[PDB]
Symmetry: C2
Subunit: 796 residues, 2 copies
């Protein structure tokens, strides 16, 4: 035993399990770089491999593209835990493989994607981004699974002596930002695929979570928050939002956001959430809007600096109906028919006012105030909210004033924002002495304390109510995790709520800590009791800052019995690749991997049974097995011999007579049947006809290992495996290259994968397979919940 190979007894201990968890933080080493100049590709490929050992591939066109993709990415799928950079240069034209297809492939393998096939050989962009490969390897400054990034990691700082060649790195926070972004993008993809009308692209966020305002507007979605109780902001007015009171954050380390013109994005993404029609006064330039998707929005912009080119550019970039007007806004006409407001009749309207003067400012504002006080009251228009900049040294009385707030990304600015609303205060006297004293307290707070005051404006798009009783009709979109997962929320009452949402054809995306993965991480000693405790399903969390909170853990089998399928964040962004406008990430996160995300069973069966590369588990089914085989001296053919030996032991334990089968143990045949026999199973008996070949599913086995360390696509894969029990046709509306990893019959159809017996047999040896691979340091709980979920998928 100790002196034999393959060897699991000396090589796989609790320490090796720890190291595998650690290696999982590095499971995204891929960069996909598209350019149109092959000699330039060969030069930097050799440069980055000679200097840092980056594995490089070039898809040059000397081989057909489908074959080129299949060979390259079947190789790469096994190296993803090798802790070394991988770079695929793509030099074929866009007519051979399109930008959107290559982006789907790259993101399905957790890679960064760079598209530069239109640039000539000596572009500044092209040479610079190619030289970055050599400078940064094994790192790269293009995010994985997303073109954009705005966190504190600044890659140029790694090359500067002034910074000591260092930069910030908040893997957990950044991956949490990437997750909120992807969940939003998946809802965006769901809205397009279900042809949901534009003015109904609304998503309910259960529990307040500020970044969803920006992510939703980046995708043309309006967010609504749902909260159990209403925290009294402590200010004046009917909702307490006139000079609200503050309570401070805890000592930490600071996470800084580097969005350009962040102060304008914060107010404008919020206002755009309130109405599909916007009156924007002072809009020039509004370059910050160019990065949003505003399909269905109508913006009536007023600024003397508006040109005809500005209106055309803004509409082209955002997709919104923009109507630029190069006149100063006339605040002293009190008519609807003036200022072109006629278009907004019998519809809702919100107003954003960014106008300011250097002459007669303080009474210029009361002209605007008197006009906005008049404007909020029309019955031919449903004016929802008016944003105005406020700075007064003289006391004023204001009507319909709902809120008077500081600016979260305002720093030392003495300027405030006033919000007008129908349900606001009938009258209130704003004494300029207390706003000055208020702005002195605000400007003396830490930037972190200032940014958290955005909860005051965001509560103007918040609803009070129990999320477990909301209306689910209309395919309503809901994203829900902590605030739903546990507020002492009964696990029964949550599971029933999710069960009803699936039956109502609703889109409630749900996330929760994975009970059995967390347990396994604690047992092997990766997560310590001082950081995370657990008693059955109840979890007590803590982050390194000192905050603690309770949460309920769920498992894949509990949610499948409630009509919910686990899908990974990787699969979600790849599936949504042609709609995603979010951020990417640079590092994976152990803490984020403890959580699993789920989607309703009805939407899986409707849209997801035909697995192309976007929903492939290829980035998980090969790299864990390959890593273990390298540590444990498991030759390639020896691995397949082991699968036969485990089948032989299993069949003997079910009192099958060995004379009825012949163990082969190959890559194509597990065993041959001699006499017909049957094996008891909960999904009905497994029937093996005599003189047949049986080849059990390796995807199931290797995903069982993978489910110990990261979120598993096991249940989504199982549903696609059942679908692929017979030959299928390739969908005609999808690009053929998305199927390079789907094997094809001689007639050009999609070949069947496995029979039902071949799948469920793998489920039965699955426990002993993990016990073998992990030296009995596996988790029977994780195997059992998966096993129990495979059985429900194949239920008879």
């Amino acid at each position: 035993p100790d002196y034999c190979i393959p060897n699991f007894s000396q090589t796989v201990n609790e320490r090796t399990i720890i190291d595998i968890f650690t290696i999982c933080r590095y499971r995204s080493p891929l960069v996909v770089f598209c350019l149109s100049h092959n000699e330039l590709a060969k030069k930097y490929a050799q440069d980055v491999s000679m200097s840092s050992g980056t594995h490089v591939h070039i898809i040059d066109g000397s081989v057909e593209i489908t074959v080129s993709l299949y060979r390259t990415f079947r190789t790469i799928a096994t190296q993803l835990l090798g802790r070394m950079q991988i770079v695929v240069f793509v030099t074929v034209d866009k007519s051979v493989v399109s930008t959107q297809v290559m982006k789907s492939i790259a993101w399905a393998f957790r890679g960064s994607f760079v598209e530069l096939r239109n640039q000539s050989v000596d572009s500044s962009t092209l040479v610079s981004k190619l030289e970055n490969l050599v400078s940064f390897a094994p790192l790269y400054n293009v995010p994985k699974c997303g073109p954009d990034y705005y966190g504190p990691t600044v890659y140029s700082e790694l090359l500067s002596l002034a910074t000591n060649a260092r930069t910030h790195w908040y893997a957990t926070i950044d991956y949490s930002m990437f997750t909120r972004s992807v969940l939003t993008g998946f809802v965006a993809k769901y809205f397009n695929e279900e042809a949901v009308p534009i003015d109904k692209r609304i998503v309910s966020i259960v529990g307040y979570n500020p970044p969803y305002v920006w992510t939703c507007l980046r995708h043309g979605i309006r967010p609504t928050y749902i909260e159990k109780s209403l925290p009294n902001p402590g200010g004046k007015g009917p909702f307490g939002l006139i000079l609200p009171v503050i309570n401070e954050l805890v000592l930490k380390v600071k996470y800084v956001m580097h969005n350009p013109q962040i102060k304008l994005l914060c107010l404008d993404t919020f206002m755009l959430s309130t109405s599909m029609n916007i009156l924007y006064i002072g809009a020039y330039p509004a370059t910050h809007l160019l990065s949003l998707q505003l399909n269905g929005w109508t913006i009536l912009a007023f600024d003397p600096k508006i040109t005809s080119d500005w209106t055309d550019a803004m509409a082209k970039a955002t997709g919104a109906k923009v109507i630029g007007v190069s006149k100063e806004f006339d605040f002293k006409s009190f008519s609807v028919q003036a200022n072109q407001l006629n278009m907004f009749q019998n519809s809702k309207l919100s107003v954003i006012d960014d106008t300011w003067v250097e002459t007669d400012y303080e009474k210029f504002q009361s002209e605007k105030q008197a006009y906005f006080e008049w404007l909020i009251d029309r019955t031919s228009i449903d004016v929802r909210l008016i944003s105005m900049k406020w700075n007064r040294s003289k006391d004023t009385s204001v009507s319909h004033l709902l809120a008077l707030l500081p600016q979260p990304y305002g720093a030392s600015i003495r300027e405030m924002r006033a919000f007008f609303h129908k349900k606001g205060a009938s009258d209130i006297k704003i004494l300029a002495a207390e706003t000055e004293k208020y702005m002195d307290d605000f400007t003396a707070m830490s930037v972190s304390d200032q940014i958290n005051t955005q909860k005051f404006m965001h509560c103007m798009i918040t609803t009070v109510g129990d999320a477990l009783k909301m209306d689910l009709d209309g395919g309503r979109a809901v994203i829900a995790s902590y605030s739903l997962s546990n507020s002492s929320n009964s696990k029964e009452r949550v599971l029933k709520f999710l069960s009803d949402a699936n039956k109502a054809k609703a889109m409630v995306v749900f996330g929760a800590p994975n009970t059995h993965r967390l347990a396994y991480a604690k047992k092997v000693g990766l997560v310590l009791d001082s950081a995370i405790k657990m008693s059955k399903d109840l979890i007590t969390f803590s982050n390194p800052t000192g905050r603690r909170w309770r949460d309920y853990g769920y498992s894949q089998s509990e949610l499948y019995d409630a009509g919910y399928v686990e899908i990974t964040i990787d699969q979600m962004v790849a599936y949504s690749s042609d709609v995603y406008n979010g951020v990417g990430y640079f590092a994976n996160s152990t803490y984020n991997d403890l959580f699993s995300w789920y989607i309703p069973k009805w939407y899986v069966h409707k849209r997801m049974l035909m697995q192309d590369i976007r929903l492939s588990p290829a980035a998980l089914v090969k790299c864990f097995t390959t890593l273990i085989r390298n540590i444990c001296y498991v030759p390639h053919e020896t691995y397949y011999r082991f699968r036969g030996i485990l089948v032989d032991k299993y069949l003997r334990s079910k009192n099958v007579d060995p004379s009825q089968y012949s163990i082969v143990g190959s890559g194509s045949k597990t065993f041959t049947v001699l006499s017909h026999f049957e094996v008891p199973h909960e999904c009905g008996p497994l029937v093996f006809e005599a003189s047949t070949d049986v080849n059990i599913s390796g995807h199931l086995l290797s995903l069982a290992i993978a489910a110990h360390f990261v979120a598993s696509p096991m249940i989504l894969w199982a549903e696609q495996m059942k679908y692929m029990a017979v030959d299928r046709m390739l969908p005609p509306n999808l690009d053929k290259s998305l199927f390079f990893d789907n094997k094809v019959t001689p007639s050009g159809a999609l070949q069947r994968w496995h029979s039902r017996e071949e799948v469920l047999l793998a489920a039965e040896i699955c426990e002993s397979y993990a016990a073998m691979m992990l030296n009995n340091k596996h988790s029977p709980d994780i195997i059992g919940t998966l096993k129990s979920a495979i059985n429900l998928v194949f239920k008879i």
Copy 2:
């Protein structure tokens, strides 16, 4: 911290443990030579798609020098990635020879396959190509050697009858590889020094059985030296007639798989006693084909000997063989008969392997009379005669030195009688006592039987203290535990080694490395229940339960005595063209605790010019890359970190920061603005203004590698000092061997670093190791290397 690069949260003691573990996998390379490029491309695809093996093809579309340079710079960074690497060479033998590609492969600890003149459908070619896909990430060709004869049988990995398992004794197998490589290095020395064949002898200090086989695989004859010999307890003068036994420890069943091991065990011993052999009954003796016996003469008697057999035996072994197709005449009794005239006034030994089914015990008596006669010649110096012994009745025997059992004979009841002149004059061997002696022998385990070869090998063993031996003539000696153990003090050992380097002898010395062993204990890899240490006094223990004392040595102590550390990897690659030993499959933590050393005089004579066989290329980058990946160190950031360390050091020595501008790139560490000096043990380091300084990166990387495995640092330092100026390429050697060195326009090898750029790197070396290993480095290891480099750059 919340910053990258990050060493504080990524490198703790557990991370150090893993690096030590990963070192067991530091030989993932296979170099496969074949002439068919589309076949290489087909299997390069099959092995990478199925197992993730990284594949390279040297296909001749690019000039060979830069193809090697590009491919092996890439590979050198990946040797610790725990993934197999395969390089296919499809260019012709005239573009890069077999012996040059073998040196390259072994210099990178790879296995080597040469099949370049085989058809695209050759049985062996397609078989060994399919073995790549079937065995990956393993391969069945040994690393750093063509042959393997241990218990690991790769075919069992594919057999369901075996449960797809096989034996795996990494520590013993690597110790066998080490013995073999040391022997080969002594053989390469014998070639370079033009040592006459009849004087190719090596003295193994301390009895060490496998050296008999490794020496005869290289045309060398072994001699053991023991301080004292326990008398075997038997009869005759030297007590070798039926010696008594004391048996071994319960445990590991390591069974060597040599074909006809019974004959190799005797024949390699008999071949150690004389260059001229009389082989009676020599057919077929296929076991001899594996040996290198150039300078031997074998006269072989067997009625089945053909002239083809005499040809294939001489072509394989290189020996001069006379093939007599006739029965030996044991009654002739003449020095001028049986063609024996050719041995007059020569040394001779006799291997007798004859038998008969009828007339046997009479046939033995006829043989015995001829041998008792033949041992007494004055015309020829008959040194030893071995005969099959199986007698049913008492006999008187003359000149009988030994009557031994067959160590690999298992249950066979026949024995071996050895005739020598210094043997018993008359002695009666009662057949009733041998019968019961063979009763006890055949009842022992196979390991107890095999160990009786000590009785044979004490006939090529001298008694005496090894520190008093004569070192004249460039004598070759292999010495390890039986020198460095606590019965002799270090001072008396170091003086012996110092007097041997002064005397221009080739004493190859090995010892455990004090600081590497202490570092493996401090971080928690080696526990006190296995190895304990009191300063430099080490108490070992292996899983069988045996315990022993030994003394640790350091690189500085031995450079003080005129000895240079050289790794096993460098020895086998330096000796590649003569090497005929075994390879290995896995590296061993236990063996990595040891260091081997050669005399400084020979380093200076033959090893200052660094071609790929002597380079540290397979160690100067794989640790740095592994750490850069763990700790998020970008490529250019790694070079700015280097300049920042020089900044912190120069300011610590009260250099004014205005005198230099830190650049921190791969080409320039910093630029000098004003002339300044920094004090140093070897004389001040002089930096003049308007100069670019680029310190030695290899020294920094090697200091890291010296924490985990043996270091070529001191050999590298001697080659570095020799490279302060340009040096002319040797016109002897193939120029592909220098693919990794920069060659000047003129055709000579370009200077590497000035004296200032080396010693500056050695001074920031401690802080570099503190940075890379999160202050969990070994100051002892840094200091012993720093003091050895200082001694190398002495003025």
